[PDB]
Amino acid sequence: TSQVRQNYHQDSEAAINRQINLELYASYVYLSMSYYFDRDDVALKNFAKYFLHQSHEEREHAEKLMKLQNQRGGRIFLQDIQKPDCDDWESGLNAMECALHLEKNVNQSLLELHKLATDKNDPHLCDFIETHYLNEQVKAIKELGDHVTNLRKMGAPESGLAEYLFDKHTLG
Amino acid sequence: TSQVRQNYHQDSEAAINRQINLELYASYVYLSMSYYFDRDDVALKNFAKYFLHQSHEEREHAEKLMKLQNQRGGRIFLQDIQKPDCDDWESGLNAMECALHLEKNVNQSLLELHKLATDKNDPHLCDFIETHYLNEQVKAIKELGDHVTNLRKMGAPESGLAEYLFDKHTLG
Amino acid sequence: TSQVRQNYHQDSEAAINRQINLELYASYVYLSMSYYFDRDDVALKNFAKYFLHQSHEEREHAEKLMKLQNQRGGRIFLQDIQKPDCDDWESGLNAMECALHLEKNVNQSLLELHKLATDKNDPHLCDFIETHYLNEQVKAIKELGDHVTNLRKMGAPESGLAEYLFDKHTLG
Amino acid sequence: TSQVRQNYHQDSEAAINRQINLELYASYVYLSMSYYFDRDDVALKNFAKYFLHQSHEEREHAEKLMKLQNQRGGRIFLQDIQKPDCDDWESGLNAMECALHLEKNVNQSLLELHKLATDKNDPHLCDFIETHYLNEQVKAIKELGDHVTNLRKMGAPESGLAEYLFDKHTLG
Amino acid sequence: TSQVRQNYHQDSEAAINRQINLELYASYVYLSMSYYFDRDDVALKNFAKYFLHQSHEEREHAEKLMKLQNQRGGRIFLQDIQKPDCDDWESGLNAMECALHLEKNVNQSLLELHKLATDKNDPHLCDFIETHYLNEQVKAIKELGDHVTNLRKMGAPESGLAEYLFDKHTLG
Amino acid sequence: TSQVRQNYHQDSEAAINRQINLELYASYVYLSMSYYFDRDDVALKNFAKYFLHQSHEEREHAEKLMKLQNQRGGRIFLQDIQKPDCDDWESGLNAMECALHLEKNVNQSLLELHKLATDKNDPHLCDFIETHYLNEQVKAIKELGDHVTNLRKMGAPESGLAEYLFDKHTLG
Ligand SMILES: [Ca+2]
Ligand SMILES: [Ca+2]
Ligand SMILES: [Ca+2]
Ligand SMILES: [Ca+2]
Ligand SMILES: [Ca+2]
Ligand SMILES: [Ca+2]
Ligand SMILES: [Ca+2]
Ligand SMILES: [Ca+2]
Looking at the 3D structure of chain E, how many domains does it have?
1
Neighbours of chain E (3+ CB pairs under 8 A): B, C, D, F
Instruction: Find the CATH number of the domain harbouring C63.
Output: 1.20.1260.10
* C-alpha distance across the termini of chain A, in Å: 51
**Are C26 and C117 a contacting pair, CB within 8 Å?**
no
CB contact under 8 A, C126 and E124: no
CA B55 – CA B35 distance, rounded (Å): 11
List the one residue out of C47, C34, C19 whose CA is nearest residue C105: C19
Angstrom distance (rounded) from CA E65 to CA E136: 15
Cis peptide before F157 (omega within 30 of 0): yes
The closest alpha carbon to C143, from E71, F36, F50, F163, belongs to: E71
Provide the 3-class DSSP secondary structure of residue C7.
Answer: coil
DSSP label at A80? -
Q: How far is E27 from chain D (nearest CA, A)?
A: 25
CB C70 within 8 A of CB C122: no
Cis peptide before C123 (omega within 30 of 0): no
Establish if A55 touches chain C: CB-CB under 8 angstroms: no
Alpha-carbon span B12 to B10, nearest angstrom: 5
- The neighbouring-strand residues paired with E79 are none
CA separation for the pair C46, D74 (Å, rounded): 72
Contact list, E38 vs chain F (CB under 8 Å): 66-67, 70
**What span, in angstroms and rounded, lies between the C-alpha atoms of F52 and C42?**
38
C85 alpha carbon – ligand 1 mean position (Å): 10
Compute CA distances C117 → B52, B117, C9, C12, C137, whole Å. 36, 17, 9, 7, 18
CA–CA distance from A121 to each of A116, A124, C122 (Å)? 9, 9, 62
Instruction: Report yes or no on chains B and F touching (3+ CB pairs under 8 A).
Output: no
F16 neighbors C125 (Cβ within 8 angstroms): no
Contact residues, chain E, for F41 at CB < 8 Å: 2-3
Nearest of A133, A95, A100 to residue A19 by alpha carbon: A133
DSSP three-state, residue F90:
coil
> CB-CB: which of E130, E141, E145 is closest to B123?
E130
Long-range contacts of range B96-100, CB-CB < 8 Å, 24 or more positions apart?
Answer: B96/B144, B96/B147, B96/B148, B96/B151, B97/B148, B98/B29, B98/B33, B99/B30, B99/B33, B99/B51, B99/B54, B99/B144, B100/B141, B100/B144, B100/B145, B100/B148, B100/C3
Which of E157, E93, E148 has its CA nearest to residue B4? E148
> Would you say A36 and A42 are in contact if contact means Cβ atoms under 8 Å apart?
yes
Chain C residue nearest residue A60, CA to CA? C56
Domain extent, residue E7, equals 1-172
Please list every residue in chain B whose beta carbon sits closer than 8 Å to the beta carbon of residue D80: 80-83
DSSP labels for B51-67? HHHHHHHHHHHHHHHHH
Contact B50, B171 (CB under 8 A): yes
Q: Distance between CA C68 and CA C119 in Å, rounded?
A: 19
Whole-number Å distance, alpha carbon E128 to ligand 8 midpoint, is 51
Chains in contact with B via at least 3 Cβ–Cβ pairs below 8 Å: A, C, D, E
Point out the ligand nearest to the CA of residue C25: 1
* Minimum-distance CB partner of A160 among B145, B146, B153: B153
Q: Count the neighbouring beta carbons within 10 Å of the beta carbon of residue C37.
A: 23
| Residues ≥6 apart with Cβ < 8 Å to E109 | E18, E19, E22
> Which phi and psi angles does E40 have, rounded to 5°?
-65, -25
Q: Are B155 and A161 in contact (CB under 8 A)?
A: yes
Are C40 and C34 in contact, with CB atoms under 8 Å apart? Answer: no
DSSP 8-state code for residue D82 = P
Single-letter amino acid, residue D97: E
End-to-end C-alpha distance for chain F, whole angstroms: 51
C-beta atoms surrounding F156 within 10 Å:
22
Question: Which protein residues have a CB closer than 5 Å to ligand 8 (ion)?
Answer: F 127, 130
Chain D interface disruption, residue of B35, B53, B61, B65, most D CBs within 10 A: B35
β-partners of residue E151 are: none
Radius of gyration of the CA atoms of chain B, in A: 18
For chain A, what's the residue count? 172
SS (H, E, C) B15-51: HHHHHHHHHHHHHHHHHHHHHHCCCCCCCCHHHHHHH
> For D81, phi and psi rounded to 5 degrees?
-105, 110
For residue F81, give the 3-state DSSP assignment. Answer: strand
Tell me the C-alpha distance between E75 and E62, whole Å: 14
φ, ψ of residue C105 in degrees (nearest 5): -70, -45
Contact status, residue A51 vs residue A30, Cβ threshold 8 Å: yes
Cβ-based neighbours of B36, under 8 Å, separated by 6 or more: B42, B88, B89, B95, D76
For C81, phi and psi rounded to 5 degrees? -105, 110
- Cα D134 → chain centroid: 12
CA distance A8 to A11: 9
Is D103 annotated as contributing to ligand binding?
A: yes
- What resolution does the deposited structure have, in angstroms? 1.9
H helix or E strand, kind and range, residue A58: helix A45-72
Q: Is C77 on the interface with A (CB under 8 A)?
A: yes
Tell me which long-range contacts B45-52 makes (C-beta under 8 A, separation of at least 24).
Answer: B45/B167, B46/B167, B46/B168, B46/B171, B46/B172, B47/B92, B47/B95, B47/B163, B47/B167, B47/B171, B49/B171, B50/B171, B51/B95, B51/B99
Per-residue CA distances from C26 to C23, C30, C55, C130, F148 (Å) = 5, 6, 7, 20, 44
Tell me whether E138 touches chain D (CB under 8 Å): no
| Cα-to-chain-centroid distance, residue C98 | 11
Query: How far is CA A52 from each of CA A22, A26, A169, E119, rounded to the nearest angstrom?
Result: 17, 12, 18, 42
Strand partners, F81: E81
Report the candidate in A20, A27, A136 with the shortest Cα–Cα distance to residue A70: A20
In this complex, the residue of F32, F41, F83 whose CB is nearest that of residue E2 is: F41
CA–CA dist C153, E25 (Å, integer) = 37
